Ligand binder design. Structure first.
Ligand code: FAD
Ligand code: FAD
Ligand code: FAD
Ligand code: FAD
Lengths: 456, 456, 456, 456
């Protein structure tokens, strides 16, 4: 079963916004549902669904700005894009390794946690097989309701408009159903001024070398935050700029270890989504807070220990902490950034993070590892907001990820699904790779179920 | 320097209540301060301080009710009773091993974490060297103020009364200064009824075998809680009663790993007590909460993984969880205990721990691993409460552990020190062994400083 | 593709002796070669090959006498019966877990090394799918050459005779090709007398409980050897007989760790068989000796450390080694066994293992963990020996495992293949599970290649 | 007790050649034997023994040419220079940490294996306390027998002559007793030509940067060998020369893991020296061979795994091994070195290491990590050879390390002791730090016993 491209002017069955892991999992699940080898009823399928994926990136990439050398996956390779739904799938990580002549070699490592670089290539290899149905260099700018009968009051399709990233021309594609799977945006502290020397972690590998071109120069470089991203950048900087002075600034008193214990981590199981979803708003908010240390503002223990050991090595060489080349400043917040000075160094003013004073740093660059927001789907959906039930000022995704729309305004064949931004309703596993294989399988059934039943 | 006993009728310089690790650390620090080999000025000491320790236990023991087989220390052997203050001390763990012909053998293990049994013997070996100045089988029942001039309004000594545990006779001992180092009491949920089949974790090894005498019998045994004590008991029961059905009942959703990461665990450093003490009440309460996972309601990762692996082994044998010999029931609370029935089994009624229904268990015994309180010193000190500054209805320990008393009611030579119950003012390390060597050294200086300066 | 049984009187294409992992891997590879889903050319296959497997065991079991509780696999689950040849196979370990509803649960363990019990069930589950073509309770007793034209001098088939284990009746089955995959036999020291109290490790779980029925009795039990089997039995005995005195007797000075380092362990790679096979007899013998510590007379480090820790715990309780409940006696050999005494205890006489005296032990049982031989195929093949090239007094397997036979005495369609006894020619991976998936694939091509090419 | 210097012209009680760890352990043991705090009888000592140490290095250093960044100790810090003999000693590693204000900080690492840099500083700190009795920049060139009565036939003292390393002047010092503790020499393959580009591992940090001054240059660098030194250099080169192509050449098929298992490693226990020494020459040679993997031609597992992981990362980027930046060439030997060419690169000719052809490498430098010999003491002792028993052409050290000399030629007060070269008679622990504390204690008793008994 090879998915063929649909002409731009034809009515699509599905239009996915984004082609990151979440969308890729849906594409794979669709391939597998139409594979007569994997699914018996697939022989009876006559027509290929008309499908298209829109991705703003020029080609498949997985958080390329954070592909720090030596950087490792944080989940078992078994939770790849296909295995948890079907180990027989040709899209498993193990089958990818086999296709590359690397299976025996990966096995000899005895590791569940491949390099981020390797796992990106696996997903890239997966993504390449859907090149006929993916349009790269397309940034979706809006989703617009359409009525096949304009004189009526019922919406039965959607228009998706995207801007070509190279040339800036706007194209439209019409579809019965939309999936929005666009991940998250860089989250910056509101207090920080805009400056080329102030860069979010997500652009670390991509944009910092352009700013600090000489690797041997004695720069002063600061890192803000204490999550995984901060730890990785802080650690890497010591290798990438050997003569640099680095400072880690955090409002917490310490880097804290991620919770990887097996009982707690069962919250990430695919079957647990039903259980999480069915809870009340108060119980869900309570559960997410209670299990926060699995995912947010936490560092893998092994990395913490490495950094800590480097700190002690500095202590051996020099007992005076103020003289260390690489330093951690706990329980601090940035009150002022001076960035209009003649010199190439900004002046960062610090105070105690403690509730109701401190030093100053001269830095060539500030890396801001302050996490992400997942609200970008809102802007894409503003023109379809009036289709929601009257008075409801927020999108409400059902268990199957389809947003609630007023039944009398929107036809049953038309719909919009959200992926990767539903943590509040679906649990901590929603933004991760943990349930993507199973969720992909669910999504295909939700969207293409009518066609798949006919063949079944 | 061998500490000789003081006659019961003589005025003591110091009377310590309790002879657990905290008091033992003080005894060792005193020995070391008078040791001319360790402290040069010690030659000039002419008089041995008149000192006595009162312990209710018949002999030195360290949480004997929880000496579960295979049970391990949770801190490095380096934080023993002497090393952090002076590695040259004859009371180090390494010197103990040397004295037992076991030093090379411990070394070959490559472990920082000795069995609790071994560390108890080390402390027992330490304790034995002070047998002249320790009175076992003495439970202190009250501390009473005394005035060397009864017609005056100034208190300058204390009377300590203790009841002989075997024979019940009351003895009095007079002292200028008192240390109260009595650890904690068993904490029981208020809702649970009194019953011989309901036993606190602290009495697990000591009292459960008396209740369930036949090791091969198919008992039903429940464990309440999800901290270290619960995990250890739950795990051990499977070895101790091979044919038993065990249930772990917890209000939390999972066992959670203790935080042993190196940056966070620096809060346990001796030098950090100054920093913690100097903070405000709000900041201290905030800090203790933030670092709770280092010590409370947490299980060492390795034990969690073991228990989890045992659970998966049960899954391999039987896919139906309700049929498992050993089970965990998360997010539950006990609403009712039926314990007046004719049969030897109580009936435990369960409900969801979730805020505003569930099963019933028939159990031969309920092990209650619900932690400890440290308020027992209050009852001992009721008759000295009037010596506090007017209106102050709680004991306030200074940095050096001496409680605040009204300067015009209490002479400068008389005082009371608290040890092991000061977490609120001194930090998380207060109840542990972490700072005992250093704290012991501090205590000796605070209490015997005037004499030690004369020789200095 | 479901393999149907062949009537006993029909000429088979293949007859496999044994249905252990090696034969099971061949069955799976055949299933996969005929699976049109996995192999495209398989559609064109018209006729199912006539195949049969003969197994002496009543049902599939994997070293059941050594299924010690808690006993673990020593290779990655990835080297299962199918994955290294094809990750898409329905016979992978991961697909088995999926079929049992256990995939997510195994994943949460983060282990490459499943319990031996679990891996046995996986293989059992695999084996069950071939029940139509496997005859259990059949012990093959001889292989006899046949000539379709008896007046000629050319052998073109083989007769395989097996004795029914329950009823003892002899059945014959004729085949063009034979595979002998019968594993190894218990290896006993020649010096030891025959006695019910002297039991090889391979019968430990199965036969020792019949001899020592009371688990609480204070037996004396000895273990001879220092390989993995000895370590496991010695360790287990302490749990299985809590009041017993156990002795480990070894001629070496210590238990030695298995080599699991990644560069050395590449010898176990499937591609390395070509390289090993092509070497001279002297170079192969040299290589096997050099890499012996990967597999023979070695104990997994983690088990050594456990046992060692138990020994140190005994030291803590009692400093006098001669009084320990569980002891290791290094550098000893057994010179005499007294087993005609009135009492239930044999008397074992010991001497120094050192080249050119010692204690005596009274034991209820001696467990002999002295490894295996793989020469049992010789007895099965005695009547076909005359078919070898003149003067050649040993079976010579080619790279593809087919033994050399005189071309003028044996027709090209007839042949005999050896599996699991070819370490001398094919390398250390030959007796293990390491190359079974790939070897199975090779074997199917070697044996059924002509038919598979026609469809190709 | 502070050891004061002896005038050069006075008869010494002891003259030690070398001031590495072995000699330092003797100095510490002497300090401790005279310390009235540690040894009670020490008060009665009236006279300080006249002692001197001669060291060719300008100051204390511990294998400075191999202080590779991140390089770690391979034995527990507990086997330092004093602890195994006396934990109360002021020369323990833990007391050193305390003296540096680093004790709490080392403890928080939870490691038994300090950096080689840290352990060097510890020993340096130890060494500094004996600066009065150590002469640096003195290379001992010969040991000469002396007779206090020249007309007699009895030798009763020794003359030790050393050359000043800076100025080259020869000085003589007379002593009753000599200790030779000079470690080992660089061992080079006889086949390799002399060349500045061919450097032994022992001079890696010291001399390679002088040869290859530009760290960013694309050099080709080869490493010969497969022991710990080779692995460390090979690994380090990748960090030190990021753009370089490195090749590891080894005659073995793989890097092999050091044996660190606890039962085997008991051979390193101090008490085991008696047992080893008492064995025959054949049994000792047999034992050393059997336990070789503890110490020789082996790499710590963790380093092997790191290097292996780096190799697999190269495989991910490029599947063609011949194109890798860093390569391992197993089972090779160097047959020819071309080093008279005009270019700065030598041409290394390789062949199979296999017993009775291969590539060529162009390299800027060859690092030769081929281990050490310990025969340098022979040259120092040639002029005293005639004092041995007639016909005996090798030095025979007793259990107490004193060489056998003819009783009628050498007076009982005069003697020579060997340290660090006695592996053949005393075991594998002889060249290591494992028994230095205890051996130091033994040596002091052997040499100064008569004086120490008088005070006892
Ligand atoms: C550095 C890093 C490492 C991580 N490692 C792990 C890990 O090891 N394991 C794990 O489980 N999780 C990990 N995560 C969590 C992460 O959320 C998931 O791995 C994954 O990226 C989520 O997939 P997604 O498709 O929802 O979002 P994304 O991966 O962000 O993909 C969304 C795609 O949509 C595209 N897009 C966005 N806007 C538009 C638009 N307007 N028009 C068209 N296209 C658009 C983007 O270019 C992007 O390619 C990591 C996250 C980061 C930042
Ligand atoms: C099972 C268990 C394991 C632990 N393991 C560790 C560990 O590995 N590391 C660590 O740092 N901490 C550990 N702890 C924390 C523990 O608080 C300390 O190790 C230590 O016991 C504290 O010493 P203490 O002297 O303050 O209190 P205690 O140890 O309780 O000693 C107080 C003594 O006072 C006696 N006493 C009480 N009342 C009276 C009275 N009225 N009259 C006379 N005598 C009296 C008691 O008998 C007792 O002996 C553990 C605690 C438990 C329960
Ligand atoms: C306790 C133990 C644990 C092991 N664990 C591992 C591991 O974790 N990983 C690993 O790679 N290797 C392991 N091995 C090595 C082992 O050799 C292989 O796992 C595997 O058993 C080899 O398969 P086989 O089919 O060649 O031989 P076997 O497993 O012995 O199977 C041969 C079969 O032939 C049958 N048979 C014998 N004679 C006759 C006859 N005359 N007629 C009919 N049938 C007959 C036998 O009943 C048996 O079922 C282990 C071995 C042992 C003993
Ligand atoms: C890189 C490296 C790391 C090691 N790490 C460890 C480890 O972690 N643990 C361990 O147990 N062992 C280790 N070893 C083994 C090592 O042998 C010991 O640690 C230790 O160096 C032995 O001490 P020594 O005094 O016998 O010899 P050395 O350390 O070699 O000291 C002998 C001294 O004599 C001096 N000398 C030599 N000739 C003369 C002369 N003619 N005149 C005057 N002075 C002279 C030398 O300068 C030297 O300082 C290591 C060895 C190496 C090379």
């Amino acid at each position: 079963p090879r998915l063929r491209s649909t002409p731009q002017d034809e009515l699509h069955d599905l239009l996915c916004v984004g082609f990151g892991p979440a969308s890729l999992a849906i594409a794979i699940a669709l391939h597998d549902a139409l594979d007569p080898r994997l699914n018996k009823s697939a022989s009876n399928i006559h027509a290929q669904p008309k499908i298209c994926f829109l991705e703003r990136q020029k080609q498949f990439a997985w958080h390329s700005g954070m592909l720090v050398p030596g950087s490792k996956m944080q989940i078992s390779f078994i939770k790849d894009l296909a295995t948890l739904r079907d180990p027989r799938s040709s899209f498993t990580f193990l089958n990818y390794l086999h296709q590359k002549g690397r299976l025996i070699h990966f096995t000899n490592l005895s590791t569940f946690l491949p390099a981020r670089l390797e796992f990106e290539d696996y997903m890239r290899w997966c993504a390449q097989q859907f090149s006929d149905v993916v349009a790269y260099g397309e940034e979706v700018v809006e989703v617009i309701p359409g009525k096949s009968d304009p004189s009526s009051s019922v919406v039965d399709f959607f228009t998706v408009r995207s801007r070509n990233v190279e040339t800036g021309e706007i194209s439209a594609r019409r579809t019965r159903k939309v999936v929005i799977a666009i991940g998250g945006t860089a989250k910056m502290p509101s207090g920080l001024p805009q400056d080329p020397r102030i860069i979010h972690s997500s652009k670390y590998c991509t944009t910092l070398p352009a700013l600090l071109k000489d690797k041997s120069k004695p720069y002063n470089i600061a890192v803000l935050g204490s999550g995984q991203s901060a730890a990785e950048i802080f650690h890497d900087l010591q290798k990438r700029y050997p003569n640099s002075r680095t400072t880690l600034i955090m409002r917490d008193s310490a880097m804290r270890p991620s919770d990887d214990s097996p009982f707690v981590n069962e919250i990430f199981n695919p079957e647990r989504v039903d259980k999480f979803y069915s809870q009340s708003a108060a119980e869900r908010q309570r559960s997410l807070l209670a299990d926060k240390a699995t995912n947010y503002s936490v560092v893998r223990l092994e990395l913490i220990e490495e950094i800590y050991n480097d700190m002690y090595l500095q202590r051996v060489k020099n007992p005076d902490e103020t003289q260390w080349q690489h330093r951690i400043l706990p329980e601090r917040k940035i009150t002022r950034v001076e960035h209009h000075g003649p010199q190439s160094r900004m002046r960062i003013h610090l105070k105690s993070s403690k509730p109701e004073v401190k030093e100053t740093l001269e830095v060539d660059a500030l890396m801001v590892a302050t996490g992400y927001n997942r609200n970008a789907h809102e802007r894409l959906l503003s023109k379809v907001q009036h289709l929601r039930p009257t008075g409801q000022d927020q999108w409400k995704p059902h268990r199957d990820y389809r947003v609630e729309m007023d039944p009398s305004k929107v036809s049953s064949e038309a719909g919009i699904w959200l992926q990767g931004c539903n943590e509040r309703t679906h649990g901590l596993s929603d933004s991760l790779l943990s349930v993507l294989a199973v969720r992909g399988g669910e999504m295909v059934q939700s969207i293409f179920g009518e066609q798949l039943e006919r063949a079944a």
